Amino acid sequence: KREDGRLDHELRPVIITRGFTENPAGSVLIEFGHTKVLCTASVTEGVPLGWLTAEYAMLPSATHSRSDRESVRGRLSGRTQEISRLIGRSLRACIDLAALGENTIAIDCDVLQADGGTRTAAITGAYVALADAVTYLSAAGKLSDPRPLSCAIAAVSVGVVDGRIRVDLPYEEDSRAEVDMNVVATDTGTLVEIQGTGEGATFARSTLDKLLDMALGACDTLFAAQRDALALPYPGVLP
Amino acid sequence: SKREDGRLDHELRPVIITRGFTENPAGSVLIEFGHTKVLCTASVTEGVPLGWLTAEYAMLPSATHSRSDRESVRGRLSGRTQEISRLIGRSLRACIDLAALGENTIAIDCDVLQADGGTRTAAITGAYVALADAVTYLSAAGKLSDPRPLSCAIAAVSVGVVDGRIRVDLPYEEDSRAEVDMNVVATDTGTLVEIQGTGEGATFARSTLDKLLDMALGACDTLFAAQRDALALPYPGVLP
Amino acid sequence: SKREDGRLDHELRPVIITRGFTENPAGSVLIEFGHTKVLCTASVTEGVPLGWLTAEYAMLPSATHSRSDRESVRGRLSGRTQEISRLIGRSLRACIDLAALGENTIAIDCDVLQADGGTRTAAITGAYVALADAVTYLSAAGKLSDPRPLSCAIAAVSVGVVDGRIRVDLPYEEDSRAEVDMNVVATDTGTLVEIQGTGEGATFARSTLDKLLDMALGACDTLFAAQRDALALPYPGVLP
Amino acid sequence: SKREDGRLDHELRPVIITRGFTENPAGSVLIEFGHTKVLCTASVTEGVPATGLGWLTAEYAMLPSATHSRSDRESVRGRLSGRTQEISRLIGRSLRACIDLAALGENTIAIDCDVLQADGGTRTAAITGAYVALADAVTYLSAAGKLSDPRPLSCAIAAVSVGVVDGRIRVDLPYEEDSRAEVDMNVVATDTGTLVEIQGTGEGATFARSTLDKLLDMALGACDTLFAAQRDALALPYPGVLP
Amino acid sequence: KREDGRLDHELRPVIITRGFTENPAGSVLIEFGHTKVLCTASVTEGVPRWLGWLTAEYAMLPSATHSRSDRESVRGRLSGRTQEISRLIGRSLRACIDLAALGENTIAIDCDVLQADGGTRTAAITGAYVALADAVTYLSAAGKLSDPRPLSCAIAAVSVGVVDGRIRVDLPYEEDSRAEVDMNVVATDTGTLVEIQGTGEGATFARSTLDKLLDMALGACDTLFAAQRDALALPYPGVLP
Amino acid sequence: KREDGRLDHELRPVIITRGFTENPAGSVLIEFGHTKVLCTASVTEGVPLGWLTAEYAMLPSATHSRSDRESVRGRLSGRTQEISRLIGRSLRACIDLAALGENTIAIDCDVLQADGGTRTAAITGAYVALADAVTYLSAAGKLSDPRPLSCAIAAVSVGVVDGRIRVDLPYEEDSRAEVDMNVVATDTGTLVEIQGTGEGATFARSTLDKLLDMALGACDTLFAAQRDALALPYPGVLP
């Protein structure tokens, strides 16, 4: 067994809390084990066909050692930009921006604690926030079509650690992985993206297929967790 | 007769203090003043630029009623951010013996998850508890030059004149109509630390100041008790 | 009994106010608090971004005893700068009826030519005189909805506990020793705008606060007089 | 052949590799994928910014006039675009996968990829060209006797864009094809039959796993041509005067 | 003889290649010996804040210098040298163009140094003019010109200074660093001056020296103007509108 | 005819006020007509052979219409950097940095009011400040050479306005000059730089002769003004 007592194919405990804050149309605190990310979906009137932007960031204290605030430093880190763009791509893949009307949805993912898999947790939670924002826009009757979402989005890290394929890697496993990867998938039997291979690793087709098989199994578990959380009543006051 | 949320003029919104909200920081405190939520962390490092303490305040884009642009993306800190950041630094350093801490550095981070008025005062109140936990952590690791670095407790609350009445801890609703606004920082040893941030366009008589101070200082006593209650619990994590 | 510059605890440094120091701005005021020299200007423009006023404070690199780095060259505004800039803007707006001004904008610039303590209080005191000249200018150009946009006068002074004594208008040396010190922003009507904390962070008794306010408000009276004397002269324009 | 430039779906644009385009850097390669043009240089430095292993960094930029309509300089805006940082990081990650930094010794190689003309596939061209520049930088260091081992390079790196355009799977997409593709991505591979990365590009889309397999098939088939083009160019004499 | 193999009045081999890239209306790779600069002219309709306008920007690729230099976009700011040279280029090119005759169109000039071995800004100006000409040719063929001949003269520039007690033109990096005094001279094919600038660090000069420097510089520009005409005599290498 | 009643070859009234502020070693308020520039020279304990650096900036209200503060914009204008570099290069031409101590002299030129010829005023004033800074340093025994200054620096603007050559152009003339430039010279019969200004224009060789003749005549007057002001005692003293 792993360090956290998990089996190789097991996700960490996933906790999805809708309406963690009240101002955003969507506000979801998602936890993959000790990894905690607050994902919000803010709605505005007027695009700059609707639009969806995505921004990812980590609180200075989220990491084991405190990192400098990017605002203080005066610039975004490369990693930040990389992840933000991944999230933006991932979410747009399952939303019909024409059915959204000329609206703008700003996705914000702020990591409160980082113990590996922060970008995949962020994507998984961001989708729930997006669902709530859409529910909100629907109530306020601002959607060109009642169902802009064509599929659900989830994501999970996967890699070879200690000679074995494992899913949802915490910090310690990730730093030890001979090959690692982030998989974004839909509940409608399709892929959205495979992202961010670990530094210095090259993989064979067979290895890719096995990594995908693992990740897709785990994603199914994520879709269910999302469905369970979304089955509850909207945590706020509908327009 | 009563405020929009049913409160009396002297009553604080419900106060919730959760220590060990995250594991990595030596101190991690989620504090809530009603709907206002601020994550307050205290990170510990060795060396300095006596020890030092620095503080940074920030608001998540979605914390406000309408999303605000991320400062890192905009490429600069807003004036509000530097004002409040410096306030927190001054306030906290007021009750620490940096000479009795070692050549260590405590970085205070206050990140607003939801803004509903009084974020900077909640931030200060929560930051003190985080600091206290950072001091406990340092103590266990045998890093202190003196066993008791903290010389007093810090707390803070907003006060103002809304509807011609002197009220404490203003939400956004009240704070937007306040005839006069401000933030008071005080110690649990009867002393003051700072009075700050008068509402836009607001002026106030000397006599009004004294009533505002009376009220604020009353609420702070409630805050110090809440802090003590929270700090009574065991350290919420693994200790060196 | 006597301070380094031969002053009593309650005495202000010699105050000099020179209007029309430059000709381009509607208001151009060189104010001096002893050795502290601040050029305060008021620029008038078309419309807002009810009129609006903004304020910006900055120190010339050579103003400080040891040359400080130019902010433009550094690539960022210091926190102290934004903090003071905001205070100046708010203070002035507290004694203007923007409606009486009509859609219009007054840009306040306070640039320190020489810093010897109390640069921000000098900047506020001088800025008001520049603002008055800006109003005078706008009136002559017949761009004012109301002839009397100014509802009161604004001045400010530093005060603190130095060498165990309550003292007003602290120079650089006294400021660095100050056990406690602050900037009091007052109106000539009899109200307060702000009491800005400044140090690294300190605690003071409420009775001490009352003393500090008492002396500070007295010194401001002297400042309001200096403002009137200067403003009693003819507009150094450049009349429209 | 229903492609704007006359190509079949599986065909690469004409590839031109010119080594020693400039003479100051240890490696300097102008690479062309049809009308796309990228200058890929490799500058060598003594030491590293601590264990005993060298380092390789990568930066990618587009000249203002490279795009169809002039774009503003990032230096003038005072900010790096997310696109720039994204590509810069991928290039460095891709090249490091085939270089033994220990066997390299404590030397640092700086890869710079500047787009002179942009007509799609600029980051895949950048990667493909950067490897040749890297190889030349290694030849330089080898001759100067600054290597802990004579052969730090364990494989060759190339990349090509692939996607679904006009309902067909196509490789090496120009500007116009890329801007209308249902699905598109950049495949980075080695010449040892392994994958380095599959970089998603564009607005965002979903694709069946069977489609991915087809995309990889054609992309990897195109990379073989790229690997041969790199070989043929490197078979020429070193354009500079090895120490 | 110089370490170059050149005489004191000799320019390094000059190469001008029009249509190096296809996207810009004008695109010229110019080489003063080992110095290589890509000079582009991008046509835009309309005007900034405004007669038409011309802007100029100069930059060096990190590897252009002997030791790789930091990318300005990564630094987070332009260097003073960059803005100094960018402005010099803008003034120089606008001096020989009638922006009225150009209509309300904007020409953006970009000079990116691929390899630096002295005289990069002068090479940039010389190559930029050729690109400007091609841009004017483009606009004409499109018809978006108020007057068929907005160019009133040809612009060229060269470096010159006193090295080892002798006056020389087109200084490489080598001589550039040993120069008692050196500067950049921009001139027209009419024989008039456009600008003299960038005196070497810590150097002063008598008017008699300045006159010697200018005479030398003007001679060299004659050669440059010939090179420009030769290159511009070839057909437009792009695909006219 | 010229607006202010000046002939073509004469300067606006020049006023030089040393010790305008006390903190810096050299502090000079110089005025060319209505142009006012505060030129200071600050000393330091080292360098980056001594060193001299210069910075020029304009107060927002210095111009007819307020200009944006550069620190607020977040970047230096090209004009600012162009002039800063010119000023530092000019002053360095007449000082033996080796003769100077192992110290730096930071030159700051801040324009209080701009009515044309700010940069030539800045240079002309900056030298006087530099002089006082040298006086200060030698009086502190922190100089290696009793006389680091090998010459005096002064500058004036010259151009063609209304078809005729004129010296020291105010704003109204500068904004309509066909040809325009700034001449930096020494008091020892040499030149330092001829900085082109304006939008850009050509001028004949013989025109350059006329421009320099008139400009160099004006500079002599400036050299006089500098001498007279430096003839007065140093305000402050240092044993």
Short mmCIF file of all heavy atoms in Angstrom, two decimals, chain B residues 81-117:
data_model
loop_
_atom_site.label_atom_id
_atom_site.label_comp_id
_atom_site.label_asym_id
_atom_site.label_seq_id
_atom_site.Cartn_x
_atom_site.Cartn_y
_atom_site.Cartn_z
N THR B 81 -4.60 47.97 -1.13
CA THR B 81 -3.83 46.81 -0.69
C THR B 81 -2.59 47.20 0.12
O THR B 81 -2.28 46.57 1.13
CB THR B 81 -3.39 45.94 -1.88
OG1 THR B 81 -4.54 45.26 -2.42
CG2 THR B 81 -2.37 44.91 -1.44
N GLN B 82 -1.88 48.23 -0.33
CA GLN B 82 -0.69 48.68 0.38
C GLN B 82 -1.05 49.34 1.70
O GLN B 82 -0.35 49.19 2.70
CB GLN B 82 0.12 49.65 -0.50
CG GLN B 82 0.97 48.95 -1.56
CD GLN B 82 2.21 48.29 -0.98
OE1 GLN B 82 2.29 48.05 0.23
NE2 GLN B 82 3.17 47.98 -1.84
N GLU B 83 -2.15 50.09 1.69
CA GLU B 83 -2.65 50.73 2.90
C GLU B 83 -2.93 49.69 3.98
O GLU B 83 -2.37 49.75 5.08
CB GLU B 83 -3.91 51.52 2.57
CG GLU B 83 -4.64 52.09 3.76
CD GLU B 83 -5.95 52.75 3.37
OE1 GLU B 83 -5.95 53.55 2.40
OE2 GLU B 83 -6.98 52.47 4.01
N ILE B 84 -3.79 48.73 3.65
CA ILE B 84 -4.18 47.69 4.61
C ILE B 84 -3.03 46.76 4.99
O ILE B 84 -2.91 46.37 6.15
CB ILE B 84 -5.36 46.86 4.07
CG1 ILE B 84 -6.59 47.76 3.88
CG2 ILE B 84 -5.68 45.71 5.02
CD1 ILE B 84 -7.75 47.08 3.18
N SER B 85 -2.19 46.41 4.02
CA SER B 85 -1.04 45.55 4.29
C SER B 85 -0.14 46.15 5.37
O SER B 85 0.26 45.47 6.31
CB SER B 85 -0.23 45.29 3.02
OG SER B 85 -0.95 44.49 2.09
N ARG B 86 0.17 47.43 5.21
CA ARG B 86 1.02 48.14 6.16
C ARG B 86 0.35 48.23 7.54
O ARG B 86 1.00 48.06 8.56
CB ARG B 86 1.38 49.53 5.62
CG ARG B 86 2.35 49.50 4.44
CD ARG B 86 2.35 50.80 3.65
NE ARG B 86 2.64 51.97 4.48
CZ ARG B 86 3.86 52.38 4.81
NH1 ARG B 86 4.92 51.71 4.37
NH2 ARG B 86 4.02 53.45 5.57
N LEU B 87 -0.95 48.49 7.55
CA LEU B 87 -1.72 48.53 8.79
C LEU B 87 -1.54 47.24 9.60
O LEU B 87 -1.23 47.29 10.79
CB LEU B 87 -3.21 48.76 8.50
CG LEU B 87 -4.17 48.55 9.68
CD1 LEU B 87 -3.92 49.59 10.76
CD2 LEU B 87 -5.61 48.60 9.20
N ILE B 88 -1.74 46.10 8.95
CA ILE B 88 -1.61 44.80 9.61
C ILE B 88 -0.20 44.60 10.18
O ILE B 88 -0.04 44.10 11.29
CB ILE B 88 -1.95 43.64 8.67
CG1 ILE B 88 -3.38 43.80 8.14
CG2 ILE B 88 -1.78 42.30 9.37
CD1 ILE B 88 -3.79 42.74 7.14
N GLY B 89 0.81 44.99 9.41
CA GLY B 89 2.18 44.87 9.86
C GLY B 89 2.45 45.69 11.11
O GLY B 89 3.03 45.19 12.07
N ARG B 90 2.04 46.95 11.09
CA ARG B 90 2.16 47.82 12.26
C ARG B 90 1.44 47.22 13.46
O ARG B 90 2.01 47.09 14.54
CB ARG B 90 1.61 49.22 11.97
CG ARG B 90 2.42 50.03 10.97
CD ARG B 90 2.02 51.50 10.99
NE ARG B 90 0.63 51.72 10.59
CZ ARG B 90 0.25 52.04 9.36
NH1 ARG B 90 1.15 52.18 8.39
NH2 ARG B 90 -1.04 52.22 9.09
N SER B 91 0.18 46.85 13.26
CA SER B 91 -0.66 46.33 14.34
C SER B 91 -0.04 45.13 15.04
O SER B 91 0.01 45.08 16.27
CB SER B 91 -2.05 45.97 13.81
OG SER B 91 -2.71 47.11 13.31
N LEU B 92 0.42 44.15 14.26
CA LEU B 92 0.97 42.92 14.84
C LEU B 92 2.32 43.13 15.52
O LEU B 92 2.55 42.60 16.60
CB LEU B 92 1.06 41.82 13.78
CG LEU B 92 -0.28 41.25 13.30
CD1 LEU B 92 -0.07 40.18 12.24
CD2 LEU B 92 -1.09 40.70 14.46
N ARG B 93 3.20 43.90 14.90
CA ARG B 93 4.50 44.19 15.49
C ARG B 93 4.37 44.90 16.84
O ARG B 93 5.32 44.93 17.63
CB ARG B 93 5.37 45.01 14.53
CG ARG B 93 5.95 44.19 13.38
CD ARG B 93 7.00 44.97 12.59
NE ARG B 93 6.44 46.17 11.97
CZ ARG B 93 5.92 46.22 10.75
NH1 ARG B 93 5.88 45.13 10.00
NH2 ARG B 93 5.44 47.36 10.28
N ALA B 94 3.20 45.47 17.10
CA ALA B 94 2.97 46.22 18.32
C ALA B 94 3.01 45.35 19.58
O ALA B 94 3.28 45.84 20.67
CB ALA B 94 1.64 46.96 18.24
N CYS B 95 2.76 44.05 19.42
CA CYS B 95 2.68 43.16 20.57
C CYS B 95 3.69 42.01 20.53
O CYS B 95 3.54 41.02 21.25
CB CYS B 95 1.26 42.59 20.71
SG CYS B 95 0.03 43.79 21.29
N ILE B 96 4.73 42.15 19.71
CA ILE B 96 5.76 41.12 19.65
C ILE B 96 7.11 41.68 20.08
O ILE B 96 7.47 42.80 19.73
CB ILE B 96 5.93 40.56 18.23
CG1 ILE B 96 4.59 40.53 17.50
CG2 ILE B 96 6.55 39.17 18.28
CD1 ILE B 96 4.73 40.33 16.02
N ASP B 97 7.86 40.88 20.82
CA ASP B 97 9.22 41.23 21.18
C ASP B 97 10.16 40.59 20.17
O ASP B 97 10.63 39.47 20.38
CB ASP B 97 9.54 40.76 22.60
CG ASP B 97 10.77 41.43 23.18
OD1 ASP B 97 11.64 41.86 22.39
OD2 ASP B 97 10.86 41.54 24.42
N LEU B 98 10.42 41.30 19.08
CA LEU B 98 11.27 40.78 18.01
C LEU B 98 12.66 40.41 18.53
O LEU B 98 13.36 39.59 17.93
CB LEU B 98 11.38 41.80 16.87
CG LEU B 98 10.07 42.20 16.18
CD1 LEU B 98 10.28 43.40 15.28
CD2 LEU B 98 9.48 41.04 15.40
N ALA B 99 13.05 41.03 19.64
CA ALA B 99 14.33 40.73 20.28
C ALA B 99 14.23 39.41 21.02
O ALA B 99 15.24 38.75 21.28
CB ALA B 99 14.71 41.85 21.23
N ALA B 100 13.01 39.03 21.37
CA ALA B 100 12.75 37.82 22.14
C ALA B 100 12.24 36.70 21.26
O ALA B 100 11.59 35.77 21.73
CB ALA B 100 11.76 38.12 23.25
N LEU B 101 12.52 36.80 19.96
CA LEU B 101 12.05 35.82 19.00
C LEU B 101 13.21 35.12 18.31
O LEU B 101 13.11 33.96 17.92
CB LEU B 101 11.16 36.51 17.95
CG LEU B 101 10.58 35.64 16.84
CD1 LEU B 101 9.60 34.63 17.40
CD2 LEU B 101 9.91 36.51 15.79
N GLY B 102 14.32 35.83 18.19
CA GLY B 102 15.48 35.33 17.47
C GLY B 102 15.59 36.02 16.12
O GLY B 102 14.75 36.86 15.78
N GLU B 103 16.62 35.69 15.36
CA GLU B 103 16.80 36.27 14.03
C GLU B 103 15.85 35.61 13.04
O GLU B 103 16.21 35.35 11.90
CB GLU B 103 18.25 36.12 13.57
CG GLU B 103 18.63 37.01 12.39
CD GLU B 103 20.05 36.78 11.90
OE1 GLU B 103 20.81 36.08 12.60
OE2 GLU B 103 20.40 37.29 10.82
N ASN B 104 14.63 35.35 13.49
CA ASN B 104 13.63 34.68 12.67
C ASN B 104 12.69 35.67 11.98
O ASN B 104 12.61 36.83 12.38
CB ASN B 104 12.81 33.70 13.52
CG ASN B 104 13.68 32.66 14.19
OD1 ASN B 104 13.74 32.58 15.42
ND2 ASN B 104 14.36 31.85 13.39
N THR B 105 12.00 35.20 10.95
CA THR B 105 11.05 36.04 10.22
C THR B 105 9.69 35.37 10.12
O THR B 105 9.57 34.23 9.69
CB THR B 105 11.55 36.36 8.81
OG1 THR B 105 12.70 37.23 8.88
CG2 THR B 105 10.46 37.05 8.00
N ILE B 106 8.65 36.11 10.51
CA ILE B 106 7.29 35.62 10.39
C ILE B 106 6.55 36.40 9.31
O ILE B 106 6.34 37.61 9.44
CB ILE B 106 6.52 35.73 11.71
CG1 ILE B 106 7.20 34.89 12.79
CG2 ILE B 106 5.07 35.28 11.53
CD1 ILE B 106 6.48 34.89 14.12
N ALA B 107 6.17 35.71 8.24
CA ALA B 107 5.42 36.33 7.17
C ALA B 107 3.93 36.12 7.37
O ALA B 107 3.45 34.99 7.33
CB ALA B 107 5.87 35.79 5.81
N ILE B 108 3.21 37.21 7.59
CA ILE B 108 1.77 37.16 7.77
C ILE B 108 1.07 37.38 6.45
O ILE B 108 1.31 38.38 5.77
CB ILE B 108 1.29 38.23 8.78
CG1 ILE B 108 1.98 38.04 10.13
CG2 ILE B 108 -0.21 38.16 8.93
CD1 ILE B 108 1.69 36.71 10.79
N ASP B 109 0.20 36.45 6.08
CA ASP B 109 -0.59 36.58 4.87
C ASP B 109 -2.06 36.60 5.23
O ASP B 109 -2.55 35.71 5.94
CB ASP B 109 -0.30 35.43 3.91
CG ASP B 109 1.09 35.51 3.32
OD1 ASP B 109 1.47 36.59 2.82
OD2 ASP B 109 1.81 34.48 3.36
N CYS B 110 -2.78 37.61 4.76
CA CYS B 110 -4.21 37.70 4.99
C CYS B 110 -4.93 37.77 3.66
O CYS B 110 -4.87 38.78 2.95
CB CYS B 110 -4.54 38.92 5.85
SG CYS B 110 -3.80 38.86 7.50
N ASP B 111 -5.62 36.69 3.31
CA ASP B 111 -6.32 36.63 2.04
C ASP B 111 -7.82 36.53 2.23
O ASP B 111 -8.34 35.57 2.80
CB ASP B 111 -5.78 35.47 1.19
CG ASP B 111 -4.40 35.76 0.63
OD1 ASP B 111 -4.31 36.41 -0.43
OD2 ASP B 111 -3.40 35.36 1.26
N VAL B 112 -8.52 37.55 1.74
CA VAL B 112 -9.97 37.64 1.89
C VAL B 112 -10.68 36.72 0.91
O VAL B 112 -10.56 36.89 -0.30
CB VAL B 112 -10.47 39.08 1.68
CG1 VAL B 112 -11.97 39.16 1.88
CG2 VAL B 112 -9.75 40.04 2.61
N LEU B 113 -11.42 35.76 1.45
CA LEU B 113 -12.19 34.84 0.62
C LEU B 113 -13.55 35.44 0.28
O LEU B 113 -14.08 35.24 -0.81
CB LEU B 113 -12.37 33.49 1.33
CG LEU B 113 -11.08 32.87 1.87
CD1 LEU B 113 -11.34 31.46 2.37
CD2 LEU B 113 -10.00 32.87 0.79
N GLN B 114 -14.13 36.17 1.24
CA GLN B 114 -15.37 36.89 1.00
C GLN B 114 -15.39 38.22 1.75
O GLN B 114 -15.13 38.26 2.96
CB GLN B 114 -16.58 36.04 1.40
CG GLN B 114 -17.91 36.69 1.05
CD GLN B 114 -19.10 35.81 1.37
OE1 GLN B 114 -18.97 34.78 2.03
NE2 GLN B 114 -20.28 36.21 0.89
N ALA B 115 -15.69 39.29 1.03
CA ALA B 115 -15.72 40.62 1.63
C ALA B 115 -17.14 41.11 1.87
O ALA B 115 -17.93 41.28 0.93
CB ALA B 115 -14.97 41.60 0.75
N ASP B 116 -17.47 41.33 3.13
CA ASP B 116 -18.76 41.88 3.51
C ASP B 116 -18.55 42.92 4.60
O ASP B 116 -19.23 42.91 5.63
CB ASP B 116 -19.71 40.78 3.99
CG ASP B 116 -21.12 41.27 4.21
OD1 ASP B 116 -21.46 42.36 3.71
OD2 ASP B 116 -21.90 40.57 4.90
N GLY B 117 -17.57 43.80 4.38
CA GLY B 117 -17.24 44.83 5.35
C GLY B 117 -16.39 44.29 6.48
O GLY B 117 -16.56 43.15 6.91
#
